[PDB]
Design a binder for this molecule. Sequence first.
Ligand SMILES: O=C(O)CC[C@@H]1CCCN(c2ncnc3[nH]c4cc(F)ccc4c23)C1
Length: 167
Amino acid sequence: VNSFSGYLKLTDNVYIKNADIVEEAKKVKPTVVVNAANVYLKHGGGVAGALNKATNNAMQVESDDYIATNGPLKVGGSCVLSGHNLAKHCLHVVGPNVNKGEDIQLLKSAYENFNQHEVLLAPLLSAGIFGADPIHSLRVCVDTVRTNVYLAVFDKNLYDKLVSSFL
Ligand SMILES: O=C(O)CC[C@@H]1CCCN(c2ncnc3[nH]c4cc(F)ccc4c23)C1
């Protein structure tokens, strides 16, 4: 038993809710919140900009030190950093950005990072400003992640579409 509430169950291990991931993180304090990161951990907009704003820019400060030490992430890769006031940990995961021409097949590699964590609160990778089809992203999530994932979908119209079209 865990503290996530109001989710619709899609599969044995995948759950979905119309929610603002920032507010969901603030209430649940999950062990892991996933950020829709880029390779530079520049949290300017989308989910990343919202998560970072909610940390009063502490996420960005920590991220800049990470990059200065380690260099950029790989597309499809991840790193674990602090969850600040939102979660114990933040798993920064880089899905391919279609608006940069990155290979959508890397989306599966991106979701594989979730399997290193037993339970996660997450957005749909490569959705939103990353330019992928959120329905495809949901399919890859379901077919790749084996651990327990609670997906927050900010847009109510999109949430309803994802549910109604789910196979
Ligand atoms: O850009 C991509 O391709 C993938 C990232 C997606 C796209 C944008 C919507 N989305 C979210 N998902 C869950 N909660 C959210 N709160 C938010 C608050 C904001 F100010 C902006 C986005 C979100 C958001 C993240």
